[PDB]
Each structure stands twice: as C-alpha cells, then as structure tokens.
C-alpha cells in the first residue's frame, strides 16, 4: 500500500543467510539498515512519537527535545519532519561533522556541550526552561522503545523463519531490540529460544552485573552499543546469555561482511556477527537457526575506523 | 523468507505519499534507497550478473570488469562479493574519495584515468588484455537492465497502487527504470499511463532529439542522470513526455524532501520530484495518481553540494 508519511514505512526488513560465517548456513542476518532513516532506531523514533501522541504529551506546537549519540536523533528528526514537529537535539562537539550536517539537513536545531552526560543535562536544562512547550522522549526508559520491537521486529523474525528461529543475537544500546524481540517470540508465540545480548569486552557492564562483579565501564569503538550502564529498557530477565566482543574484531568482522558477503554493515553489525559466529561453531548450536540484528549501514561510518 | 545471498534481497521498496508537494496527496514516491547497496542500481547489478550466469558468459573464475559513475559500480561490487567474483572497476581521479574508500571496502580492484569516456576506454583495454578472463556487463545497453525493472519495480508499483497509478516520473541515466517500468504497466498489465522522462535543463539531449534540434550536452550537478547522449536502454517509443529541471532546483527540492517530508533523498530524487510537482499542479493531472522514482539516499551525497 501507500504510506501516509515516512514514519509508517518502518520495518519489514529482510533476512539474508551468511555463507562465510557459522556452519552450513545456520547464521542469518536482519538488515535494519533498510529503514526510513537507515537504522534500527527508525522503528522507535516512529513509535515514541506515535505513543506520545496517543497519550497527549505530544501535541501540535510542542517541541521535541532530546540528547542522542546519533542514530536515535536522526530517527526522531525524520519523524519530526514527516509529522510537522520542531525538534532540538543536544550534541556537544564530540560528534562527526558528518552527523552535524546530516541533522541540519533534516531541519534540527542543535547546540553545544563539550560527553554524553554533559549534553543530556543541557537538554534537561531546556525542558526546564518551558515544560509546557518541550517534550523529552527518553529512549533509554520509554517503554514504547521495546514495544515497537515486540510488535514488528519480533513477529517479522517469526514469520520469515516459519517459526524455526532458535537464537536471537543483538547488541545492547538501549536494550529495546533484544527485549522486545525476546518478549514477542517467547511469550506471544511461545518458543523457548536463546536470547543473546552483545556488549564490548572493553565495557562489559552487563556480564559484570550478572556475575556480581565490580561494574567498570570503559572506552571502545563499537558505536551504538556499550553505554556503560544497565539501561532500563534492557529486561535482564529474558536474557539467556551475554557475549563480549572487542573493538578490533568488531571492525574486522564488519569489513568481512562487506568484502565477503556483499553486506554494507555498520560497526556494531560486525560485533553482533562475531558473537553469533562463536555460538554457531559450538556443537550445541550447530543444528540451530541463529538470527542476528545488523542495526546500521556502512556509509554512516565512512569517517570512522571502519575504513 | 530467507535470501540465499544479498543479491536476492533486491526490491520490494515502499511507496510514501508526499504532503508538501502535488495537490491533495496525488504525488507518491518510491524509495529505491532501501536496497542491498542502497540505490535503484542494486536491481540491475543483481540481474546483469544473474543473466550473464544464465547464458554462460559469466563463469567461476572469470573476472567482472567495468566503468561506472558510481551507483552501478557499488551495486556490481556487492553482488560480486555476495556471489564470489573478483571485480575491477575503472575510475579516474574524478570521483569522491568517499566512493574510492567505499568501493575498496567492498573489495574492488581500482585504477586511474584522469572523464567518463577516459575510464571506459581503459576498461576496454583491460578486457582486450584477456577476453577469456574478463567480462564487461555494459549497463547502458545490456537488456537485463530494463528487464529487471519490468519484472520487479513495475509490478511492485502496480500492486502497491492497486492498479490506480496514472503517471510514472523517473530521471534517465541508463533509461532502464523508465523503460522497464513503462513496459510492465502498459504492456503486461495493459494500462495507458503517462511515462515521463526527466533530464537536466543543462543537458537536455532527449528533448533536443525528440524536437529535431541540435543535441548539445553540458555540465550539471544532478548526479546519476543526464549522461549527455541517448542510451540504448532508453526505449524512446514508450516515453510520453520529457520534463527538464535545473541543478539548483534539484538540490533545493531534495533539501525540502529531508526537512519537510522526513525523506533522506539523493540529488536526482529532488530532480524527479520537482518535475512531478509541476505536472501535479496542472489541472489535467490534478486528479491523477503520480508515482516518482527516488533512486538514491542522502548520505551518499554528504560531500556534495546537497549540503
């Protein structure tokens, strides 16, 4: 059919079988790069706006305000444009001039902070400046983030695998993908799959937490994941397994996806695939169907270490 | 289902209704940016390889060679990777270091020429160097280019509009999109639509030809269209109308698509939409459904005049 605006066009992303990873085609990847603003966040940018509309906190005239590390801001920005909201996003000077020119092209009003914690508080300052005019959508805790994955991404995986999916592998940024997907397949369709969270070995706060160890975040290059804390939108209770990956291997795996599979993957896509490949070569998973989320696409990383 | 490699995942791109163009939603856009390598050429990169395989000119071991202005090379490159062919593409130094790093990331063996005619002949030199090893696919004349549009892009438009499409607007680069689409809708489904070719006012060789005027190509900024000659893959006989657009307006229209529709459009996408908007505001088309091809996505243009 014909979508009334670009937000309604989210999802229905394809599954592709890998040939040079896993064992006898048991690893399949979900291309979230094929979305309105070209990442997995287009789904939650749409649903967080829709749900704020459904409950009246977002109205004609009110202005979206928020802080992002990038993909969510781009996603909110295209939805704000498609649906006629003004939007302000808080960015320090930390960020790719890439993104500054992209967000400005999408009509965003931007700022300065000089890292993530600093821009967040600045956004909070603005919402305080006029709480009747400004709405903050808060991706890390808004339930509409995992909800859209339970309603679209999860069911798409179920149908495209004819219920044969056994393992879902996804890096954790806000936690909404692994959480919403796991709830759809385990609770709505009733299949006891293995849900595998992926985080950087440099910042393994989820593994450290579950082990009852000292939580010690650190720096890494795997953009989009490893926020350095446990987000509210990560439902620990549905997580069966945590796999850690290092930045170097994440980047090499993404370069392999391009050059060997013809898949224009982002950095965190190589991270998720490297974890899935490790599981796929354990005999306990060799006969099981593993589905891996590839959150973003290669061209958003042209100024990064990926090239 | 699950695609055996990334080439099989082409197409099934969405239709979105425009709100700030046309008259009462009569203009709808087809997002070809949502493809394996993120342009409309992913379809012909796949089908030119498949068809060369079906007729034996492409075999295990033979190496793809060709010259491109970019999107087709990226498309062939991902298909070569997914399907295990070596590929050499001929590029002068004319081109975005963007694309050089992208094509190298995809595993391409590249060259130097120092414009388009020069790199073409260099590619021809290489195929002559070993005609048993090198295969040139020749997008401007290979019938598998319009054929894939007749088999996928055209039928997708038919079904997603429930046969209500009245006008198809598409810029002409090789001509395969407008040609294959027009043949599907007019001949296979039997509806007498208006097929509208779009070319730059700076290089209006199609209009000049059809008028019996002196053909005078020139420079412009509308990347992907206006090759400066009539390509063999443009079937003049199904073209009902030619609309010309200038570079400045093309760029402004693409910036409007981002900031006002939330659509991350390429430069030639703004060209096609500006032509469709002109038709859409003539009373003879005000009640007719117009479908516009948006060939590429915004991020491939970050180093260009688009920003």
Author numbering:
A (entry chain A), B (entry chain A): 2 to 115, 119 to 311
Q: Which sentences from the paper describe this structure?
A:
O-acetyl serine sulfhydrylase (OASS), referred to as cysteine synthase (CS), synthesizes cysteine from O-acetyl serine (OAS) and sulfur in bacteria and plants.
Similarly, M92 interacts with main-chain carboxylic group of T69 with the distance of 3.5 Å and M96 interacts with main-chain carboxylic group of S70 at a distance of 3.7 Å. This move increases the chances of inhibitor contacts with the binding loop, therefore leading to increased binding affinities of inhibitor for M96 and M92 mutants. HiM96A, StM96A, and MtM96A mutants exhibit almost similar or slightly more cysteine synthesis activity than that of WT protein, suggesting that the M96 plays very limited role in directly controlling the catalytic property of CS. In HiCS, mutation of M96 increases the affinity by approximately fivefold (3.4 μM versus 0.65 μM), but the affinity increases by 24- to 34-fold in the double and triple mutant backgrounds (HiM96 AM120A and HiM92 AM96 AM120A).
